[PDB]
Amino acid sequence: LPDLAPEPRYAHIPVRIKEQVVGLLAWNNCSCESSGGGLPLPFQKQVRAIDLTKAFDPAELRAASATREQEFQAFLSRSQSPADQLLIAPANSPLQYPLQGVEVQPLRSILVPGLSLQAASGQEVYQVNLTASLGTWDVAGEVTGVTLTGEGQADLTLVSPGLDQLNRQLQLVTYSSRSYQTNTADTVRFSTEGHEAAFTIRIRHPPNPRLYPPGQYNISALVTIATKTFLRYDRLRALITSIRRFYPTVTVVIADDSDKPERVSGPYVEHYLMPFGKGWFAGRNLAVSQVTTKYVLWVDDDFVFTARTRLERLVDVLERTPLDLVGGAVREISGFATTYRQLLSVEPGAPGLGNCLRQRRGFHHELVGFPGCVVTDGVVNFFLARTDKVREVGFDPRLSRVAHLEFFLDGLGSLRVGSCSDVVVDHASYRYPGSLDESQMAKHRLLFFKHRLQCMTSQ
Amino acid sequence: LPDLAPEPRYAHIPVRIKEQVVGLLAWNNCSCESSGGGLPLPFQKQVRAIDLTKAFDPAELRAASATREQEFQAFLSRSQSPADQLLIAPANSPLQYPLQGVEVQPLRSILVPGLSLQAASGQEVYQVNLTASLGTWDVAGEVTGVTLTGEGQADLTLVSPGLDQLNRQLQLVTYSSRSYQTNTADTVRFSTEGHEAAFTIRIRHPPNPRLYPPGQYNISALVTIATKTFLRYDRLRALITSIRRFYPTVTVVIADDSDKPERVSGPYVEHYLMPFGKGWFAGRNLAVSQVTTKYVLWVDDDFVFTARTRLERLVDVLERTPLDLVGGAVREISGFATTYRQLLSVEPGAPGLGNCLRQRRGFHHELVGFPGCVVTDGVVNFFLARTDKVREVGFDPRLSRVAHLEFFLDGLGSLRVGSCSDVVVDHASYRYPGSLDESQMAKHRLLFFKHRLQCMTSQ
Ligand SMILES: *[C@@H]1O[C@H](CO)[C@@H](O[C@@H]2O[C@H](CO)[C@@H](O[C@@H]3O[C@H](CO)[C@@H](O)[C@H](O)[C@@H]3O)[C@H](O)[C@H]2NC(C)=O)[C@H](O)[C@H]1NC(C)=O
Ligand SMILES: *[C@@H]1O[C@H](CO)[C@@H](O[C@@H]2O[C@H](CO)[C@@H](O[C@@H]3O[C@H](CO)[C@@H](O)[C@H](O)[C@@H]3O)[C@H](O)[C@H]2NC(C)=O)[C@H](O)[C@H]1NC(C)=O
Ligand SMILES: O=c1ccn([C@@H]2O[C@H](COP(=O)(O)OP(=O)(O)O)[C@@H](O)[C@H]2O)c(=O)[nH]1
Numbered sequence A, B: 001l002p003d004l005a006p007e008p009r010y011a012h013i014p015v016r017i018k019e020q021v022v023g024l025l026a027w028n029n030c031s032c033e034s035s036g037g038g039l040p041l042p043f044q045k046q047v048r049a050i051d052l053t054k055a056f057d058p059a060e061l062r063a064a065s066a067t068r069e070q071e072f073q074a075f076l077s078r079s080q081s082p083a084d085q086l087l088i089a090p091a092n093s094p095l096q097y098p099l100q101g102v103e104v105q106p107l108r109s110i111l112v113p114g115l116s117l118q119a120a121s122g123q124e125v126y127q128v129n130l131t132a133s134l135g136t137w138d139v140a141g142e143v144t145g146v147t148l149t150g151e152g153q154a155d156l157t158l159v160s161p162g163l164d165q166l167n168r169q170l171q172l173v174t175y176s177s178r179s180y181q182t183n184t185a186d187t188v189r190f191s192t193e194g195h196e197a198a199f200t201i202r203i204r205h206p207p208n209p210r211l212y213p214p215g216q217y218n219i220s221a222l223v224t225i226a227t228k229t230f231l232r233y234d235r236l237r238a239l240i241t242s243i244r245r246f247y248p249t250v251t252v253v254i255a256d257d258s259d260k261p262e263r264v265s266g267p268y269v270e271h272y273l274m275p276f277g278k279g280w281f282a283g284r285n286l287a288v289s290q291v292t293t294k295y296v297l298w299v300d301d302d303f304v305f306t307a308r309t310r311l312e313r314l315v316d317v318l319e320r321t322p323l324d325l326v327g328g329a330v331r332e333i334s335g336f337a338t339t340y341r342q343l344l345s346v347e348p349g350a351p352g353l354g355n356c357l358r359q360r361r362g363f364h365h366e367l368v369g370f371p372g373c374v375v376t377d378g379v380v381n382f383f384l385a386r387t388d389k390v391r392e393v394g395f396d397p398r399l400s401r402v403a404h405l406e407f408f409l410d411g412l413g414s415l416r417v418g419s420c421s422d423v424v425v426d427h428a429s430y431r432y433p434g435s436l437d438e439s440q441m442a443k444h445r446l447l448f449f450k451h452r453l454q455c456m457t458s459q
């Protein structure tokens, strides 16, 4: 909750609230409301609310809400870092120190930058006390006249009859991580008489750079095409034929959970057979797991490559921008094309209820330098993406049936999504064993749990 | 990199270098050297060096080093943040401000905590300037007598004849992210006459919590067993039989790239058929892509569950500790068991050469509260792990033949690994087509590129 109330220190100062601004803050009170029903108005779009709590019996719901709270608290505990703690720099300290930007790998050692004591010259003695909790301090060299206590310990003191001596000594302080952890931080204390500063040294490994060999744009080397089929071999073969018309050696990975699978083969085609009805997002997951190239192109099995499906153009966007995923446009026989550019946002709910997801059509802004391309949160099922980022988000195998934006919501904030309308694929002009209704309730329960959601509006 | 040379300000101050401490710093000069050959001596362990550069013609090497540098620079550019920049807090400033811990979601708004001006009373006027680059400032409420300039702009000024007024006004300052980005930061300027502070607001989404229903421990709900087989149906059936003796309803996912696949079926078994020789790590990747449970158990197809193979115990470690992956022990028919606890570290090499990997047997420290369990970097191919972390690291499908520790190296720093000797699986007492030596050269070139490695020592 944002606290607008005056501390007693300033209760005597009058303040007129800006409603306009207080409205921008997080009030942790979200809900999901439907558009008034009836005949729709021009310009206005109809908003439909889903109450995810209605996917459970209220008895079950209380159980779910409890176990979900427990799992969330667990999640917090594993994920949160001393570097995420709110630290306020004090005013009017002699203490100069690094506030951010200081990092060491577990069990290694660094010179600490920018440590200094800017006090008054003349004072008989000058002393600074450094405290760590996951490391130890030492000096790269000893300054004549500075006395050190606790070299190679968690607590170091430096004391000097000369201020220039002390400061030069500080320029040489080293920090060492003592115990192995993968990704954490030490909140160190730098102090002198009547003054205290807290700062954080991050203890972590450099990230896996996951560098791919370019091996201009070699599409066969850079891109693998991934799809999932179920009992639609005609569409699938028509797709592969259409791909081969423009890209003869690009790999096509096909996941398939058909009951009696047909043989799918040809040069540069890889067929994966799954247990019957394992599902949609699982085949998506399977297909992506097999990609060896920097990039993966998702297409549905009922799509058809044209001359408008210029993958070079998508490759270009990913090569030249920080995007992770860039969607094309899928065009009907009717000549209408969609980019299905979607915005997803999660809004904070009351404590223990969970959050509210808002989906609405749209985008954030135009992608500078690339006309017809925008940045949004979700796109249609025709996209090129960095294989690694896709795998990193995943196609949750639990979504066995009806699912699309759930990938983009799993990816929310982690995946940098764009959408280009000029790269176009065609959509070609008994299929679900069991209760769709069940699958839907199942999905709602899953989304409720997995994302801590109470409800959602679709728009 | 380390500069120990004095700025002219202190060149006149004598310093005696501590060799033992300067020795702890990164000198960016690593190499990989073999133990002297000849007959081994009883206490020494033999260290073998691989020069990864030798896996290429001088032509190929120059090409790959260039391309690798390019891809690395790209990687840096997409990954690095203003929040990683070194900031030094100045001494003797009246400016109090948040040094870390302040974060807003893209396009959202927060009260900035801890802003104030601790100047002395008695001045005729007090003014502060706030500057942002990816956001704008406003106030939640207006203090009588404080003049605001730039409300809703990147630059805000607060001017006041009263210091208490200014500070109350500061308590109400709000920051708003203006442009949509997924994970970045704004470095703000807080300023008053003759004084400047820099601090960073992180602009990012809260992470996907990825909560699992628990469903003591329901192993069928929590754990899926994953394996990969190739023409070893007898071992595989022996494995499934052995599992079913202790765990009748735990799902077993089997990836299989046999040329002539046999039927593998029975309750709770899922068989995945792959193109012949698609490979080792790919089947591993495939199997994990199909796991729907919080946890996955990796077992080789030649393993055999006994009464020692008590998964509850592994489940327990992951439920009660921040580990992501916990390896068991694999016992030979000879009665010897291995946990294959491995340490991997990357050491900085000279500019443009790449880094050195050191693998050595060992662990970091004992896992407090769990006798016989340790924290290490790599383990044997019997382990329970959080599915999501396994998928996040990946079994690179390019490792089609011989690979094991490459998963742990891909995960290095990202995966919290442990190993318990008391959970024990038996190893039972038609090889891949192609050239081993080719695969090995291939893998060397891959590791050279992928991980920016020049060389490695095995120990
Ligand atoms: C663009 O990338 C593709 C894919 O990486 C390159 O094609 C691949 O090139 C290698 C040779 O550099 C081929 O390997 C050869 O395979 C045959 C067996 O098929 C074997 O007899 C040879 O000894 C050799 O290993 C590989 O087959 C080939 N793959 C494809 C998709 O055809 C391609 O050269 C790159 N450049 C351009 C400009 O296309
Ligand atoms: C431990 O976790 C497993 C997870 O599979 C639990 O078993 C599963 O429980 C669900 C819900 O009760 C069963 O669903 C039902 O299946 C029948 C058909 O088999 C169907 O008619 C119902 O509409 C419903 O979908 C699911 O089959 C079952 N899976 C099995 C038996 O392996 C198991 O109950 C948990 N154990 C305990 C004691 O908590
Ligand atoms: O098993 C599937 C196949 C597709 N889709 C989604 O539905 C779209 C396809 O819609 P269409 O009306 O073309 O149905 P189709 O007959 O092509 O499956 C895809 O883009 C997916 O996002 C789904 O949820 N499950």
Ligand SMILES: O=c1ccn([C@@H]2O[C@H](COP(=O)(O)OP(=O)(O)O)[C@@H](O)[C@H]2O)c(=O)[nH]1
Residues within 6 Å of the ligand: B280, B300, B302, B381, B401, B402, B403, B404, B432
């Ligand atoms: O296709 C494969 C199968 C296994 N392994 C690795 O080799 C070990 C198995 O060694 P073993 O001597 O038991 O050989 P196996 O005949 O069991 O494959 C595993 O634990 C894996 O890490 C591999 O590199 N490639």
Ligand SMILES: [Mn+2]
Residues within 6 Å of the ligand: A300, A302, A427
């Ligand atoms: Mn369709």
Ligand SMILES: [Mn+2]
Residues within 6 Å of the ligand: B300, B302, B427
């Ligand atoms: Mn074996």
